[PDB]
């Protein structure tokens, strides 16, 4: 009963360690990227690239696309928008079959391309040769290059480049040429004329190759030169737009800085050029007519134009941060090593990117010819900015993860990558993104197959001061009936398994299965606690009322192979009893729970000589309920701990341990403490796999917390655990309260004579065959040796003695009465009639007599008797108890201590009763003194006896 209030007392943090199993081609991606050592990998990629360019141009050289006429109508005529999108998809198809109809296409991606298709069209040959038998390295490369030959409306495909990008440009030039055929701009250099041939729809078929695009752009530049010349008439003529290239477009730290410095220099000059003013004042003079903005809407309703050009500010920040590139070329060992440089370069390219992103905000078929030509000239300067180099996951010994909208992107040897958690088929997986794919899960495509993952959405609202008088006057989950302790929730999103695969194949995602002995299709037995804590994160019963919070951070550690195993392990910090208010005065909270209850029992745990630990449970009046041992096994300290925890539940009990105050056996004891206090911080009993009723007492979501957070700052109490002096716990007859308090030494005869003159009598009991030594301890010491100091001590029984052996071990069994005879007989003392022989003993003059009398008395007083080999460790008293018997542990029936170690544990438990008397007898809240004096124990031992 008393402990059932001690749930949800304080929050606790754990880090959970689990192994990781690589899934799919993740381990290959990792191993492959451990290239180093330079190697021709990039050289062979370049060779594969140029045959891609060749095959592409050759498949499209003398090509002619049928639907081209259909589409060109829709666009040039007088919804047309959807018919164009449709006929564009038809065209994207028509490009792809022409690409797939080329010879050698079915050897794209297949290893079979290594042979003739590369050894024939050398430095290059040795580079190719070097990747025979190593073809899998281009797996990721192939998955990326696959998108060239796709009819899907994606920006990376050959069909999209030609049909969705270039073809509308080509047609828009056809629309512009009306003004150039008019006004007689017969272009300079177009000798003998017939430039009109460029703006017949059919001429586009000749621009499906890079070499036809070059030719088209070159001549159209000549026209634009004459167009720009036509500005002199003082209305204005739209310039022609250039077509983008066929899709053909980081060796060291020395080379890259010149590229950065160079492009930045070209760019800011281009951004200070007339290109920008021409775009702005064309965009202003368009009055917004036929200008469309991001899936789109037209500016014809307005105000906004001049709110838009004032992103001039993107030019100002490019300029500033280009100047800030003085940290690169003025102030600069490798570049990636530099705190500022890496940041200044990223700040620079980012600022460019936002300019491009801002530009791309514009763009339908009827769009304004002049505005969009100026926009295109300016944008051609920026579309070079796909710089997209790196400075790398599993290069390092660890990767740090974040599960949240919070990743820093720099400490440059410890930057956060995204972690995602994915559930499928009752298993748990960990995905960790390559930084270039961090946004793959921001808006994932809607799931369509049956084979899906459930991705964990990590919803956290930190520090609510995020966002109308001052401080004295809804897409989030916030639940209906400051929010800090409700501002966390996990929710789920179905994601199609093929999308996850695509990222792995592309080397953009590193997916692992989270594994422990309990996460297997072959798993058996109860759950390990850390498996349980982990499961409870995702268990809906916790999401409904949070006990377990996932701290957003996590770390992965990688030991690479060296035909040993590639080992990955995961550490996940978590908080348990998240959002509870920490109980201030926990020890009193327990002391007041005990104060209320009569029925409390005690568990005493002691260090033993033959048992490392001995546990003894006793009731409130002193009776032994259970006395159980180490070596009694029917990771060892974990078992005792798990046992002792059950006993606290089973017996409604507190725990009493030795106070290691003034003082190897005592090292495991301190380990046991630590483990025992650790355990009782947060105790969970129900370790079942099915986990049916975890909200009950001691279930996962209602753990008990019976002890205070371990810190070394500890006094004599830690919750239900109390510490008591070890004084005379093992060397005391529990049935009498008797202990050997004689401070003895055979110093000399004078001081031996009136040591033995302190006894009331020394006599023989012929009937019981023992010698009796009667005395009062007061006659021997000034100490307060309990409330009974009168005793009669008898040469009762056998004793085990270590003894002086010329051969240096031995031990023997002695019967003190018969030796006490042999000595008295040797020295002619008349004992047999039962007189008091005291006056006759102290009359002996020889010291040898007293040496041997001391030894016999000492041996009589030797209550604990042991064997070097554990064969025996028992306690025998030399005093008769309430049962007219001499206490002997070997004759125990379980109602008394079985051995000396048990006696220690028993008498430690008894002192707990004394503290229970202290706790109950004090007031609510007052400090409780637990310093038990040696005199109090002897008093308690001699009165609460048996």
Numbering used by the authors: 1 to 36, 42 to 83, 88 to 130, 134 to 246, 253 to 267, 277 to 321, 373 to 380, 389 to 418, ...
Text taken from the publication that reported this structure:
Cas12a is a programmable nuclease for adaptive immunity against invading nucleic acids in CRISPR–Cas systems. Among the Cas12a orthologs, Lachnospiraceae bacterium MA2020 (Lb2) Cas12a is the smallest in molecular weight and recognizes a short spacer (14 nt) for cleavage and the creation of indels with high fidelity. Typically, Cas12a exhibits a bilobed architecture: a recognition lobe (the REC1 and REC2 domains), and a nuclease (NUC) lobe (the WED, PI, RuvC, BH, and Nuc domains) for cleaving nucleic acids. We demonstrate that apo Lb2Cas12a assumes a unique, elongated conformation, whereas the Lb2Cas12a+crRNA binary complex exhibits a compact conformation that subsequently rearranges to a semi-open conformation in the Lb2Cas12a+crRNA+DNA ternary complex.
Strikingly, both apo and RNA-bound Lb2Cas12a are present in the asymmetric unit of the crystal. The 20 nucleotides of the crRNA in the complex are well defined in the electron density map. In apo Lb2Cas12a, the N-terminal REC1 and REC2 domains (REC lobe) and the C-terminal wedge (WED), RuvC, and Nuc domains (NUC lobe) are arranged in an elongated conformation, with the REC1 domain and Nuc domain at each end. Two flexible loops (Asn33–Asn45 and Lys478–Thr498) connect the REC and NUC lobes. The overall 3D structure of the Lb2Cas12a+crRNA binary complex adopts a triangular, compact conformation. The REC and NUC lobes lie adjacent to each other in 3D space, creating a positively charged cavity in the center. Superposition of the apo Lb2Cas12a and Lb2Cas12a+crRNA binary complex structures demonstrates a 103° rotation of the REC lobe with respect to the α-helix of the WED-I domains of the crRNA complex in its compact conformation. Residues from the region Met493–Leu523 of the WED domain participate in major conformational changes to facilitate the structural rearrangements associated with this rotation. The flexible loop (Leu477–Lys493) connecting the REC and RuvC domains of apo Lb2Cas12a transforms into an α-helix in the compact conformation, folding back at the C-terminus of the REC2 domain. Significantly, the loop-turned-α-helix (Leu477–Lys493) harbors a hydrophobic patch that interacts with Trp871, linking the REC and NUC lobes through the BH and RuvC II suspension helix.
